[PDB]
Amino acid sequence: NTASWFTALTQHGKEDLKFPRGQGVPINTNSSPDDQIGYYRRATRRIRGGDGKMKDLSPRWAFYYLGTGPEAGLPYGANKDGIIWVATEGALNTPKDHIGTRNPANNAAIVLQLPQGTTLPKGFYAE
């Protein structure tokens, strides 16, 4: 049982996450140009709201390197609801088992940061 290497993006708006081609891979100085590829997975948590009724919190979208997390078996570009793909120019379309997922017992999450020119899509924030 593991976690994303990075903190999540919170969807405060109403649009599903998407990044233009070449953008969206979180910065990780412990990874190489070939490794810069993966997917974000949506996770919507439910909570007992103020009025006693169950309700959805804002969705979170967590990054996983290609071939590693809850959808480790998916090839790049696979169509699946709640899954969107990202790849930096020059990345290799190969699984990243050498990066894998994070064990929270011995590694903090990396704060999700994107290169300077990239801005997060509308309604998206790295909290």
Numbering used by the authors: 48 to 174
What does the published report state?
One central protein involved in the formation of regulatory ribonucleoprotein complexes (RNP) is the coronaviral structural protein nucleocapsid (N). The N-NTD possesses a peculiar, hand-like three-dimensional fold, with a β-sheet palm and several flexible loops, arranged as fingers around the central β-sheet. The latter, together with the extraordinarily long basic β-hairpin finger, constitutes the positively charged primary RNA-binding surface.
Interestingly, though widely used as a biological tool to mute NTD RNA-binding in a fl-N context, no structural characterization of this des_mutant existed. We determined KD values for des_mutant Y109A by MST and found that it binds Ext RNA around 25-fold weaker compared to WT. Yet interestingly, it still binds Ext about two- to three-fold stronger than the R107A mutant. Notably, while significantly reduced in affinity, the mutant still bound RNA via the primary RNA-binding interface. Yet, mutation of close-by residue R107 had a much stronger effect on RNA-binding, underlining that Y109A should be considered as RNA-binding impaired rather than RNA-binding incapable in future studies. A prominent example is the proclaimed loss of RNA-binding capability in Y109A that had been misinterpreted before, while we here–together with a recent study by Estelle et al.21–revise the effect of this mutant, facilitated by an atom-resolved view.
